[PDB]
Ligand binder design. Sequence first.
Ligand code: JPX
Ligand code: JQ6
Ligand code: JPI
Ligand code: CU
Ligand code: CU
Ligand code: CU
Ligand code: FE
Ligand code: FE
Lengths: 46, 27, 120, 923, 98, 48, 48, 48
Amino acid sequence: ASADGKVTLTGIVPTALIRDAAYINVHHGRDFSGALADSGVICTPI
Amino acid sequence: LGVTRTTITLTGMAPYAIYVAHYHKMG
Amino acid sequence: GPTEGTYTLAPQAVVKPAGPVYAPAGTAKISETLGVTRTTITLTGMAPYAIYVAHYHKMGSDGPAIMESRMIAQASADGKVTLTGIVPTALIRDAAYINVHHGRDFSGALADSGVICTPI
Amino acid sequence: RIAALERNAFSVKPSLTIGYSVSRTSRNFDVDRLFPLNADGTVANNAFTSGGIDTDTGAQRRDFGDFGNASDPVVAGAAGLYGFADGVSYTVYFTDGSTATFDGLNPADYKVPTGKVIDTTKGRNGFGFNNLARYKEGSTDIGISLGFDTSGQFSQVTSGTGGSLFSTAGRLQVNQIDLNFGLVTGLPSDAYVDTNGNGKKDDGEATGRGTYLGSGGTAAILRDPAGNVYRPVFFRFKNATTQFSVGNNPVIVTLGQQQKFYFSDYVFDNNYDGRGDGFTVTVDGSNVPVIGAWKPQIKGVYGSRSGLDGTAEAGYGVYYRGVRAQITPVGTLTAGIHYAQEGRDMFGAAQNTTSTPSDVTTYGADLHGKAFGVELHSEYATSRVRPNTANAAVQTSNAFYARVATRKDNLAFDLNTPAAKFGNDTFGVSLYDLNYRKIDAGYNNVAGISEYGYGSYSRTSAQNIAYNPDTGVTAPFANLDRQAYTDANNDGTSDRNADGTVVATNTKIGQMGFGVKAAANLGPVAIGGYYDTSTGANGDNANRMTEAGGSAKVAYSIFSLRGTYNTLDSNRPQIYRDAAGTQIIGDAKVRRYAVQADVTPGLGLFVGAYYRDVNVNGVRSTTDRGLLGRGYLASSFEPGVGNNAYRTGLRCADNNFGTGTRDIDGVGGVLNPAVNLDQSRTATCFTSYGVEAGHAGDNANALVKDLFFRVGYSRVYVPTTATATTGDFSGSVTYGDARYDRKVGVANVRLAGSFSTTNTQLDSRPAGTRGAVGLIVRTDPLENVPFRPQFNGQVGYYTADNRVAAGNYNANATKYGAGVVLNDFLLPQTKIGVRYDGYMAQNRQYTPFDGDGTQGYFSDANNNRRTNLNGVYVEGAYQDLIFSYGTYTLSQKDLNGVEYGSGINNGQPARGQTFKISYKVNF
Amino acid sequence: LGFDTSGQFSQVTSGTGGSLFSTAGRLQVNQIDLNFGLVTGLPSDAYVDTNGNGKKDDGEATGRGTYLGSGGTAAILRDPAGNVYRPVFFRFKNATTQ
Amino acid sequence: RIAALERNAFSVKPSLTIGYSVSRTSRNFDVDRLFPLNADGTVANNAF
Amino acid sequence: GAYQDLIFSYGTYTLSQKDLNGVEYGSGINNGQPARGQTFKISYKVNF
Amino acid sequence: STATFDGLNPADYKVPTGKVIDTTKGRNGFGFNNLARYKEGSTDIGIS
Ligand SMILES: CCCCCCCCCCCCCCCNC(=O)[C@H](CO[C@H]1O[C@@H](CO)[C@@H](O)[C@@H](O)[C@@H]1NC(=O)CC)OP(=O)(O)OC[C@H](COC(=O)CCCCCCCCC)OC(=O)CCCCCCC
Ligand SMILES: CCCCCCCCCCCCCCCCCC(=O)N[C@@H]1[C@H](OC[C@H](OP(=O)(O)OC[C@H](COC(C)=O)OC(C)=O)C(=O)NCCCCC)O[C@@H](CO)[C@@H](O)[C@H]1O
Ligand SMILES: CC1C(O)C[C@@H](O)C(C)(C)[C@@H]1CC[C@@H](C)CCC[C@H](C)CCCC[C@H](C)CCC[C@H](C)CCC[C@H](C)CCCC(C)(C)O
Ligand SMILES: [Cu+2]
Ligand SMILES: [Cu+2]
Ligand SMILES: [Cu+2]
Ligand SMILES: [Fe+3]
Ligand SMILES: [Fe+3]
């Protein structure tokens, strides 16, 4: 998250896998190896 | 064509934290 | 045809944690042989990554600690510390409770004063 | 912030080794041949082994000595104690001051003085003597090392903007790399400075430890009077990634070195090594609107052979290109075409040397798949090679085949699965193979631009098949070659090798033919047949090899009766032994017919009677010379009801004996838990008849649970003298085997036994009686008696009366070994253990590994010598400090009793003693 | 420039061993006296001990002469831009032998 | 404490360069004299 | 040309210097052929 | 010893050193430096 909270997330995913996804949830992490610390800091439908 | 690039730009977050974001299905 | 949708995200309201629940619990196996004592304190549900100094506090609770029994270790990623120590029996004579504490440094130090204690 | 700190932080890993070692020997023999063999065949671990297990060269722990700091390999023959110890190895001095080493027990037989060297009388009489004694002076060694590992989080790369006429966006593709790097303090013993770029250590390149003094070893140590030790720090890394891919859905472009690609067999079978450096593009049209259900695909390859390489190399100034296109119009039938080309540029046409063609241009099409209940596999190719030189005279060569058969996933054709199935079980005519072949004579791996292949894989096994698993030559049919006597230097007599084998000159003839294998499944009956004729590409009958055959089985209840007829008519030369036993090259005719009946009562037992009759070149041919294996369609049946499978291969090892004469242990395999002697067959088709009962313990409802025996009797045909037409079934073989594991109480017993009363020399086994027995006991720790003892045990006896044309000698062996481990000894965490092993042998020997895949083995030799290997090994342990002590003695006497061991000829055995203190410590 | 370590590597724990059996392991903790770090350059008295005696014989190596640019003024591994390069060595001294 | 750790910590910077190149000439002339000149007088960038 | 970030560069150039007669002194081995230059590159910039 | 003459006519090599004499080793004591340069096609991965 930079130094003032300027986190910029990006990523490619085949549309076929995406199907039935309803909301892109943003969580905090415990390390750069994925993992889940907080369960939903910010989120939007689609 | 068949891939999806997604740019979630967040601001006013925590100074040096990790922000893992993915797509949660309907449930 | 670059189908593009721009959506502002809402700041949420439910931010409950996700990981090891700090619920201290465990057992002790003090085993005497030929004048030496080997103590194994396997703990679970502890802090995910923390040094856990444990020694033998004498009776007196407050009481002094026979510091020639300090067992030091750090926890894993779920909170599992395995303290192990070799102490002469004559030293641990007149000890009352094995008190586990928190370690400010791998050199020892008692950050906390007893997160868990077992009567010996 | 802590994660950021950890991402690019060093993990400091220090290592300390502490240990005391002393070892004194006088001959440096081997002791790993005394230790028990585990159920996986490995020998039991000990503290004295030198190691040396190499799978590439077949080396094992039993091929090297175990005393001193030397790992001297055992030497076969008399120089070594007949494969039991180290060689004598005199040293020969020369006039010019140079010296050589003679490996023999008698220096007078040094028949190899070089052209100008003369033996100077500097030693005894110009011959020295290399001392056979090895010493490890007792010392305690501390070894300290340090390394710096990285977090391992640098496994990704993201592309950056580029371009000159324009500018790409950047950050468009993420590539996963396989870079493993860290910091080391000291160099490995095998490091070197590669000054040529070949990537291999040439003649004394640098010995990197010698380039950077103080890196490692004891020759140089960078020190300080204060006691500090300095070691250079190096950045070590491996890059396993050489390919980078770009693009996701329709188009993917891969750039890298040694690109591996595959258009088809016969064109670009260029995988398993790759061809060179360049790029490949793959376009997948499986989502196109109009035509996407046919899964159209396009592949394109460009590259430079071997990348950049110095002149005189085949890949200098040579570049390849290609494009293939395929679809799947029906269920699984994939059809494709492909163009391939390889050529020299203006810098390769000149100053390249070698013989790479000035140009090769191959076209092809293939139709592999499974569409309508049948499986089709077709292939066509055209070469058009431009043969460099000046006139060139471009040469064309095609390769076409059309097969109705089942190909496996590894692209090998499975001829046991029908792929036709024109009916059900009651009426089940099944087509197994139906193929045609028109491979041309000039079609090799150069014609179709591939790495290897397109030639008979065996020339003794199925020789019409080019499929080579070793070099990845996936090609059903091979370019056959014609063989003939060489007669290189001498005239009038054909050239032979030292062993007597013939030397042949091979001329490629190509291949053209057809073949059908089918089977009709009746009810209680089943029948099958096969036919196959292959000529040369031109079609001349001087190279024809026809195999035809057929079998019929009837199985009902607990009875089965089979009858098989096989033929082989090869005008093609073929290399094989004649009746006398000398290899020859010449046409062959083989006619075999076998009627074998089997009965299975169902209680785990089985009985089998057979009568097999071979007929080679018109004579009764006691044993076929492997000729019947020249064809790839053999297809015998198998006993049992409801087992109507027409599997390729004549099961000649059925209901017959074994002819093994080699063994890992001293005794004839009866003491090896990884060898089942009751399941040992000869795999040679004989003209014989006999019966064989038995019993299997794995089959349920068996008399004894884990019990196997294979008692059997047989009679073998032998001609009158050596080559007479007349003969009789005079040979006789009576064999028996047994194996019973059991577990009585806490102990784990294991009994094995073998017997044989052959009358003639069958394959390599001489004519004589041969018996062997072995017992292995392994008790688990006893928790009732004090000390928690844990016993072992091992006994093995072997006898053999070899009646060879040069003697009637007896070769017997006796191995034994016992040992007890006390798991609770006085003080806490204190252990003691002792093991005594012994091995006595009459005229037997050990043959070490040959440096190839073949391993060493114990065999019978007429050496009038008796070996008496013995030893005791005591291993005690305090908490974690291990004291190992071992004393062993090897004495090899002759009939007189001269005691040749310790070959300084003083009548003393070779002796070895070792003492170690081991202590493993971790930071 | 020097790189010191935390000095927390002063202990070793034994590991399981044995061939006829297998010891438990982690049974004894030994205190060692290893002092190590990273140096950039060699001292004046360093030398290459090619015999094992542990002493500087007649002109053994003059370790600053083996690794040019380690120290002194006789040799300096330079760069036209003005950068100076010095080899990095792992220095260590082990006072524990029992 | 994190600042103290970061003060004397190494930043590990790895670099990877991947590229394919082939070039054949008989005289080795110059082609940069053909490319357009920018408003600052520099010649246009090219890959050759 | 450029796919996502992989750049394919190809270039073919010819330099011929004749005289009034037309001797074509380029490629000065004196065989009446111009100097020629061809290059092919695949470039890919990656970052850690 | 050898020298390099920079000219289209070796006969104008008016600078033979004090004691050197042209040995008829090449055509007539004068060779010819090849004017052709080659970069054999390869893919390079560099790691740092
Ligand atoms: C998006 C990028 C757009 C294209 C960029 C501009 C390039 C095209 C312009 C014409 C440029 C290409 C014109 C074709 C020259 N010919 C070649 O093929 C030569 C082959 O070498 C040698 O081979 C021998 C037998 O094989 C003989 O013929 C020799 O005589 C020859 N050597 C010589 O003496 C030198 C002539 O390769 P080269 O050394 O010149 O290498 C480079 C070539 C050409 O480069 C490309 O253009 C490939 C681009 C593919 C991207 C595919 C990826 C698509 C991504 C969506 O690359 C090849 O391999 C392809 C072969 C030609 C087919 C071109 C059509 C796709
Ligand atoms: C998805 C897309 C992937 C892209 C990557 C794949 C690229 C595919 C490229 C396909 C191009 C068409 C091929 C035509 C086949 C003609 C059939 C064919 O190969 N002919 C054979 C061969 O030919 C020689 C070749 O011909 P060629 O026309 O191939 O080369 C011209 C040109 C190359 O330009 C440059 C860089 O100089 O390449 C093209 C087409 O652009 C040539 O003139 N080179 C001179 C030198 C001679 C030695 C090679 O001559 C004989 C043997 O000496 C004989 O054996 C012929 O049968
Ligand atoms: C167009 C376009 C766009 O602009 C916007 C948007 O639509 C897109 C980005 C998707 C796009 C890109 C589309 C892109 C994906 C391209 C389409 C994909 C296909 C795949 C390309 C190749 C098609 C050709 C086909 C494969 C050839 C078929 C011929 C067979 C091979 C013949 C075999 C016969 C054999 C010889 C018989 C056997 C004989 C013997 C004797 C051997 O037995
Ligand atoms: Cu050995
Ligand atoms: Cu090359
Ligand atoms: Cu292959
Ligand atoms: Fe080399
Ligand atoms: Fe010295």
